[PDB]
Amino acid sequence: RGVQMLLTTVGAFAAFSLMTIAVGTDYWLYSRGVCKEVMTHSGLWRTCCLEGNFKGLCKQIDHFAEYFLRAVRASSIFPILSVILLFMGGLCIAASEFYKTRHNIILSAGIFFVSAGLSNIIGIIVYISANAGNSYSYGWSFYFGALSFIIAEMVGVLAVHMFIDRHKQLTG
């Protein structure tokens, strides 16, 4: 009893915090490069030198048919959508405590949490393939992105489970 609403609200906060950190940090890809050759860590927006005379200097990464994947990478729309959709899911499951007995809000939260995970997957694929445009390796903010997807799918499943559980009781 109640554990489902606790676990959903906590999972949604966890997913949102993980994804907002992941999208907002500079540690997606370890690679060689130049910031102004040294080992360099790139996020989504900025690439910063970590092991040399400009240790701690960042430049905005220059992202510029084939044009359109470049544009999708430059905007990173799908990561940001995953944050927006997790926020909307939170503003569903942290609102369903009021206006109780409509039940469609929990389904809307579940649909949001699932579709945000799909958006995270498309974001990951776009990032992995735009970086295909070697010694490289991925960093904690990428793995936090994946963990946000994994938790988002769970909170989605629990939201659909609460939608059904609170539906069947309408029969008494």
Q: Is 161 exposed, middle or buried (0-12, 13-18, 19+ CB in 10 A)?
A: middle
**Residue 81, φ and ψ in degrees, nearest 5:** -60, -35
How many Cβ atoms are within 10 Å of 57's Cβ, its own excluded? Answer: 15
And the tokens for 23?
A: 């999208």
Domains of the chain, earliest start first: 3-25+66-171 (1.20.140.150)
Cα 42 from Cα 29, distance rounded (Å): 5
CA distances from 118 to 32, 111, 124, 153 (A): 31, 11, 10, 9
Cα 26 from Cα 59, distance rounded (Å): 11
Q: Hey, what's the torsion of the CAs at 95, 98, 101, 102, to 10 degrees?
A: -40
DSSP label at 60? E
Cα 118 from Cα 133, distance rounded (Å): 23
